[PDB]
Coordinates of C-alpha atoms in Angstrom, one line a residue:
Chain W
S1 CA 3.9 -11.1 28.2
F2 CA 2.6 -9.6 25.0
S3 CA 6.0 -9.8 23.3
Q4 CA 6.1 -13.6 23.4
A5 CA 2.4 -14.0 22.4
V6 CA 2.3 -11.4 19.6
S7 CA 5.3 -13.0 17.9
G8 CA 3.6 -16.4 18.2
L9 CA 0.4 -14.8 16.9
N10 CA 2.2 -13.5 13.8
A11 CA 3.8 -16.9 13.2
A12 CA 0.4 -18.7 13.2
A13 CA -0.9 -16.1 10.8
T14 CA 2.0 -16.7 8.4
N15 CA 1.5 -20.4 8.5
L16 CA -2.2 -20.0 7.8
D17 CA -1.4 -17.5 5.0
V18 CA 0.9 -19.9 3.2
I19 CA -1.7 -22.7 3.4
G20 CA -4.2 -20.4 1.8
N21 CA -1.7 -19.7 -0.9
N22 CA -1.1 -23.4 -1.5
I23 CA -4.8 -24.0 -1.6
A24 CA -5.6 -21.1 -4.0
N25 CA -2.9 -21.9 -6.6
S26 CA -4.4 -25.3 -7.2
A27 CA -4.8 -26.3 -10.9
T28 CA -1.9 -24.0 -11.8
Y29 CA 0.5 -25.7 -14.2
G30 CA 4.0 -24.6 -13.4
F31 CA 3.5 -24.4 -9.6
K32 CA 5.3 -26.0 -6.7
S33 CA 3.7 -26.1 -3.2
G34 CA 5.5 -24.2 -0.5
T35 CA 5.6 -24.5 3.3
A36 CA 7.0 -22.3 6.0
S37 CA 9.3 -23.3 8.8
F38 CA 10.0 -21.6 12.2
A39 CA 12.8 -21.4 14.7
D40 CA 12.9 -20.3 18.3
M41 CA 15.1 -17.5 19.6
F42 CA 16.6 -17.0 23.1
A43 CA 18.5 -14.0 24.1
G44 CA 20.7 -15.7 26.7
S45 CA 19.3 -18.5 28.8
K46 CA 16.1 -18.8 30.8
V47 CA 14.7 -15.9 28.7
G48 CA 12.4 -16.5 25.7
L49 CA 11.9 -14.0 22.8
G50 CA 9.1 -15.8 21.1
Chain F
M1 CA 3.0 21.4 39.3
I2 CA 5.3 18.5 40.2
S3 CA 7.8 16.5 38.2
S4 CA 6.0 13.2 38.4
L5 CA 2.8 14.9 37.4
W6 CA 4.4 16.5 34.3
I7 CA 6.1 13.2 33.4
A8 CA 2.7 11.4 33.6
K9 CA 1.1 14.1 31.5
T10 CA 3.7 13.7 28.8
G11 CA 3.1 9.9 28.9
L12 CA -0.6 10.4 28.6
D13 CA -0.2 12.6 25.6
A14 CA 2.1 10.1 23.9
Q15 CA -0.4 7.3 24.5
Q16 CA -3.2 9.5 23.1
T17 CA -1.2 10.1 20.0
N18 CA -0.6 6.4 19.6
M19 CA -4.3 5.6 20.0
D20 CA -5.2 8.3 17.4
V21 CA -2.7 6.8 15.0
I22 CA -4.2 3.3 15.5
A23 CA -7.7 4.7 15.0
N24 CA -6.7 6.5 11.8
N25 CA -5.1 3.3 10.5
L26 CA -8.2 1.3 11.3
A27 CA -10.6 3.8 9.8
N28 CA -9.4 3.5 6.2
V29 CA -8.8 -0.2 6.1
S30 CA -10.5 -0.4 2.7
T31 CA -9.1 2.7 1.0
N32 CA -7.4 1.8 -2.3
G33 CA -3.6 2.4 -2.3
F34 CA -3.5 3.6 1.3
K35 CA -0.1 3.3 3.1
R36 CA -0.4 3.0 6.9
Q37 CA 1.4 5.2 9.4
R38 CA 3.4 4.3 12.5
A39 CA 4.3 6.6 15.5
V40 CA 7.8 6.7 16.8
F41 CA 8.8 8.3 20.2
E42 CA 12.0 9.2 22.0
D43 CA 12.6 10.2 25.6
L44 CA 13.2 13.8 26.6
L45 CA 16.2 15.2 28.5
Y46 CA 17.6 14.2 31.9
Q47 CA 18.4 16.4 34.9
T48 CA 21.8 15.4 36.4
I49 CA 21.8 15.8 40.1
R50 CA 25.2 14.0 40.3
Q51 CA 27.4 13.9 37.2
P52 CA 28.0 10.3 36.0
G53 CA 31.6 9.3 36.2
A54 CA 32.4 12.2 38.5
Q55 CA 35.7 12.4 40.4
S56 CA 34.5 11.8 43.9
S57 CA 38.0 11.7 45.5
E58 CA 41.7 11.8 44.5
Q59 CA 41.3 8.5 42.6
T60 CA 37.7 7.2 43.1
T61 CA 35.1 7.8 40.4
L62 CA 31.4 7.4 40.5
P63 CA 30.5 4.2 38.6
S64 CA 27.1 5.8 37.9
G65 CA 25.6 9.2 38.5
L66 CA 22.2 10.4 39.5
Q67 CA 19.9 11.3 36.6
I68 CA 16.1 11.9 36.5
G69 CA 14.2 11.7 33.2
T70 CA 11.9 14.5 32.0
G71 CA 9.4 12.4 30.0
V72 CA 8.8 11.0 26.5
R73 CA 8.3 13.1 23.3
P74 CA 6.7 11.8 20.1
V75 CA 9.4 12.4 17.5
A76 CA 7.6 11.4 14.3
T77 CA 4.6 9.7 12.6
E78 CA 6.0 8.1 9.5
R79 CA 4.2 6.4 6.6
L80 CA 5.3 2.8 5.8
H81 CA 5.5 2.6 2.0
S82 CA 5.3 -1.1 1.8
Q83 CA 3.7 -3.0 -1.1
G84 CA 0.0 -3.3 -0.9
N85 CA -2.0 -6.3 -2.2
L86 CA -3.7 -6.4 -5.5
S87 CA -7.3 -7.4 -6.4
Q88 CA -9.3 -8.1 -9.6
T89 CA -11.5 -5.1 -10.2
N90 CA -11.9 -5.8 -14.0
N91 CA -12.1 -2.3 -15.3
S92 CA -10.4 -1.2 -18.5
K93 CA -9.3 2.1 -16.9
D94 CA -8.0 0.7 -13.6
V95 CA -4.2 0.4 -13.2
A96 CA -2.1 -0.9 -10.3
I97 CA 1.6 -0.2 -9.8
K98 CA 3.8 -3.1 -8.6
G99 CA 7.1 -2.1 -7.0
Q100 CA 7.9 1.6 -6.4
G101 CA 6.9 4.8 -8.1
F102 CA 4.1 7.4 -8.2
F103 CA 1.7 8.8 -10.8
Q104 CA 2.2 12.5 -11.3
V105 CA -0.8 14.8 -11.2
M106 CA -1.4 18.6 -11.6
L107 CA -3.1 20.6 -8.9
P108 CA -5.5 23.4 -10.0
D109 CA -3.0 26.1 -8.9
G110 CA -0.3 24.6 -11.0
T111 CA 2.1 22.6 -8.9
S112 CA 2.5 18.8 -9.1
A113 CA 1.4 16.2 -6.6
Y114 CA 2.1 12.5 -6.6
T115 CA -0.3 9.6 -6.0
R116 CA -0.5 5.8 -5.7
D117 CA -4.2 5.5 -6.7
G118 CA -5.2 3.8 -9.9
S119 CA -8.9 4.6 -10.3
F120 CA -8.5 6.6 -13.5
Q121 CA -11.6 8.2 -15.1
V122 CA -12.2 10.5 -18.1
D123 CA -13.3 14.1 -17.8
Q124 CA -16.0 15.6 -20.1
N125 CA -13.3 16.7 -22.6
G126 CA -11.7 13.3 -23.0
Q127 CA -8.6 13.8 -20.8
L128 CA -7.5 11.0 -18.4
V129 CA -8.3 12.4 -14.9
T130 CA -8.3 10.8 -11.5
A131 CA -11.1 10.7 -9.0
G132 CA -11.4 14.3 -7.7
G133 CA -11.0 16.2 -11.0
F134 CA -7.2 16.3 -11.1
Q135 CA -5.6 15.3 -14.4
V136 CA -2.3 13.5 -15.0
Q137 CA 0.6 15.8 -15.8
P138 CA 1.7 14.2 -19.1
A139 CA -1.7 15.3 -20.4
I140 CA -3.0 12.0 -21.9
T141 CA -6.3 12.4 -23.7
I142 CA -8.8 9.8 -24.8
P143 CA -10.4 10.5 -28.2
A144 CA -14.2 9.9 -28.7
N145 CA -15.7 6.9 -30.3
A146 CA -13.1 4.7 -28.6
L147 CA -13.7 1.0 -28.4
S148 CA -11.1 -0.2 -25.9
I149 CA -8.1 1.3 -24.0
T150 CA -5.2 -1.0 -23.4
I151 CA -2.3 -0.2 -21.1
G152 CA 0.8 -2.3 -21.6
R153 CA 3.2 -3.6 -18.9
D154 CA 5.4 -0.6 -19.6
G155 CA 4.1 2.9 -20.0
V156 CA 2.7 2.7 -23.5
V157 CA -1.1 3.2 -23.7
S158 CA -3.1 2.6 -26.8
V159 CA -6.7 3.0 -27.9
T160 CA -8.8 1.3 -30.6
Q161 CA -11.4 3.1 -32.7
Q162 CA -14.1 1.6 -34.7
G163 CA -12.0 0.9 -37.8
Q164 CA -8.4 1.0 -39.0
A165 CA -7.8 -2.6 -37.9
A166 CA -4.8 -1.5 -35.8
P167 CA -4.2 0.2 -32.4
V168 CA -3.0 3.8 -32.3
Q169 CA -0.6 5.0 -29.5
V170 CA -1.7 7.9 -27.5
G171 CA 0.9 8.6 -24.8
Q172 CA 3.4 7.3 -22.3
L173 CA 2.6 6.9 -18.6
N174 CA 6.0 7.8 -17.1
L175 CA 6.2 7.5 -13.3
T176 CA 8.4 9.3 -10.8
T177 CA 10.3 8.0 -7.8
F178 CA 12.0 9.7 -4.9
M179 CA 15.2 9.0 -2.9
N180 CA 13.2 8.9 0.4
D181 CA 9.5 8.1 -0.1
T182 CA 8.9 8.3 3.6
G183 CA 9.7 12.0 3.7
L184 CA 6.8 13.0 1.4
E185 CA 4.1 14.8 3.4
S186 CA 0.6 13.7 2.8
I187 CA -2.3 15.9 2.0
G188 CA -6.0 15.4 1.5
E189 CA -7.8 13.3 -1.1
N190 CA -5.0 10.7 -1.3
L191 CA -2.1 12.7 -2.6
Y192 CA 1.6 13.4 -1.9
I193 CA 3.7 16.4 -2.6
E194 CA 7.5 16.9 -2.8
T195 CA 9.3 18.2 0.2
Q196 CA 13.0 18.8 1.2
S197 CA 13.2 15.5 3.1
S198 CA 12.6 13.5 -0.1
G199 CA 15.0 14.1 -3.0
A200 CA 14.1 15.7 -6.3
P201 CA 11.7 13.4 -8.2
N202 CA 13.2 11.4 -11.0
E203 CA 10.9 10.4 -13.9
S204 CA 11.2 7.2 -15.8
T205 CA 9.4 4.6 -17.9
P206 CA 8.1 1.6 -15.9
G207 CA 10.5 -1.3 -15.4
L208 CA 13.7 0.8 -15.6
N209 CA 16.0 2.2 -12.9
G210 CA 14.1 0.3 -10.2
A211 CA 10.6 1.6 -11.1
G212 CA 7.6 -0.7 -10.9
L213 CA 5.3 -2.1 -13.6
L214 CA 1.8 -1.2 -14.6
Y215 CA -1.0 -3.9 -14.4
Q216 CA -4.3 -3.0 -16.1
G217 CA -7.6 -4.0 -14.6
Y218 CA -6.2 -4.3 -11.0
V219 CA -6.3 -2.0 -7.9
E220 CA -4.0 -1.9 -4.9
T221 CA -5.6 -2.2 -1.5
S222 CA -4.3 -0.5 1.7
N223 CA -1.4 -2.1 3.5
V224 CA -3.2 -2.4 6.8
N225 CA -3.6 -5.7 8.7
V226 CA -6.5 -5.9 11.1
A227 CA -5.0 -8.7 13.1
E228 CA -2.3 -6.8 15.0
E229 CA -4.3 -3.5 15.2
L230 CA -6.5 -5.0 17.9
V231 CA -3.6 -6.2 20.0
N232 CA -2.0 -2.8 19.6
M233 CA -5.3 -1.3 20.9
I234 CA -5.2 -3.6 23.9
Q235 CA -1.6 -2.7 24.8
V236 CA -2.2 1.1 24.3
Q237 CA -5.3 1.0 26.5
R238 CA -3.4 -0.8 29.2
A239 CA -0.5 1.7 29.0
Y240 CA -3.0 4.7 29.2
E241 CA -4.7 3.2 32.2
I242 CA -1.4 2.7 33.9
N243 CA -0.4 6.3 33.3
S244 CA -3.8 7.5 34.6
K245 CA -3.2 5.5 37.8
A246 CA 0.2 7.1 38.2
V247 CA -1.4 10.5 38.0
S248 CA -3.9 9.4 40.6
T249 CA -1.2 8.2 42.9
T250 CA 0.7 11.5 42.6
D251 CA -2.4 13.4 43.4
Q252 CA -3.2 11.3 46.4
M253 CA 0.4 11.6 47.7
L254 CA 0.3 15.4 47.3
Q255 CA -3.1 15.6 49.0
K256 CA -1.9 13.6 52.0
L257 CA 1.2 15.9 52.1
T258 CA -0.9 19.0 52.2
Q259 CA -3.5 17.6 54.7
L260 CA -1.2 18.9 57.4
Chain P
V1 CA -3.8 -16.6 -8.2
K2 CA -4.6 -14.4 -11.2
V3 CA -6.3 -15.6 -14.4
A4 CA -4.2 -15.2 -17.5
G5 CA -7.2 -15.1 -19.9
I6 CA -8.9 -17.9 -21.7
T7 CA -7.1 -19.8 -24.4
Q8 CA -8.9 -21.2 -27.5
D9 CA -8.5 -24.6 -29.0
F10 CA -8.5 -24.7 -32.8
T11 CA -8.6 -28.4 -33.4
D12 CA -10.4 -29.6 -36.5
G13 CA -14.0 -30.8 -36.0
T14 CA -15.8 -33.5 -37.9
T15 CA -17.2 -32.8 -41.3
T16 CA -20.7 -34.3 -41.0
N17 CA -22.5 -34.8 -44.4
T18 CA -25.7 -32.8 -43.9
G19 CA -26.5 -32.5 -47.6
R20 CA -27.4 -29.3 -49.5
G21 CA -24.9 -27.2 -51.4
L22 CA -24.3 -24.1 -49.4
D23 CA -22.0 -25.5 -46.7
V24 CA -18.2 -25.9 -46.8
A25 CA -15.7 -27.3 -44.3
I26 CA -12.0 -26.9 -44.0
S27 CA -9.7 -29.9 -43.1
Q28 CA -6.7 -27.7 -42.3
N29 CA -5.8 -24.2 -41.0
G30 CA -7.9 -21.3 -42.5
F31 CA -10.5 -18.8 -41.7
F32 CA -13.3 -17.5 -43.9
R33 CA -13.2 -13.7 -44.4
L34 CA -16.4 -11.9 -43.7
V35 CA -17.5 -8.2 -43.8
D36 CA -20.5 -6.5 -42.2
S37 CA -22.8 -3.7 -43.3
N38 CA -20.8 -1.1 -41.5
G39 CA -17.7 -2.3 -43.4
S40 CA -15.8 -3.9 -40.5
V41 CA -14.0 -7.2 -41.3
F42 CA -14.8 -10.4 -39.3
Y43 CA -13.3 -13.9 -39.5
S44 CA -15.1 -17.1 -38.8
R45 CA -15.4 -20.8 -39.7
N46 CA -19.2 -21.1 -39.9
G47 CA -20.3 -23.2 -42.9
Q48 CA -24.0 -22.0 -42.9
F49 CA -24.5 -19.9 -46.1
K50 CA -27.6 -18.7 -47.9

């Protein structure tokens, strides 16, 4: 069950990383804040790939 | 002495190599310009007791044969030449390379090595040398009574003396790339040398033909993430324990066989 | 975020009348030319002279 959890672990890290980027680039002039979006993935049915 | 025992020994060896790679990656988590390495395996041959797809009768064919594996062999341990992060070291003689490319250097015997490090110093004679005593191949020298050394976005590097109210150009920091950066074999003290797997090096100014750019006053940190290393340690430990238990089961089975 | 170096503001100040005779102010663009003992050339706007 590491495969499902590890993928979710990386997704949380990426979401946290982008937040840090949006919070560090504050007071920059020509900057637009960015956010990340996720999407699930199933091989067939009843099986989850994270 | 038995097939299961040999298969389990090969599995244990593979897991030991994986653990060693993980430990080596974690050890130099702070080395500047370090590129991590990843281990890749592939299973060994198969003994075919019954040929798959064999002609069992005049018209019937076996949908599947009988094959027994022989184990797993570690095929390679490859560097991952990703892009490391950059930091603010604030040194006039510190350079970071963004993109791809290598700084050339001359070994004492005479051949050429390639590096990704940026901590450039000056020898006693005023030649730009790296940490370790090696000097860059294009032989850039820094004259005495130098106020400031400025390295542009491209390869041009200039120095300012006390007077003359204008910078004077010293040399060009051309950098070399390879067709296959992964094939370069690493050696000690953070260096790489050309092999047959990688193509012949091509030298160019920064910013052209896909080469990177030079940033002065920065330094490139290693491309190792501590987050996933720990979970890899957990998984490899569990796999190693499983293989050891398989060895134990084989030994117990054999002992109960020979107890007769 | 990286810092792209400090940027100077060269807006004109306010010419306060402090008296005396060895003090000069500029109402437009322009830098006084100065030289040191070693011969190097410096540029400034300081009005204090003696």
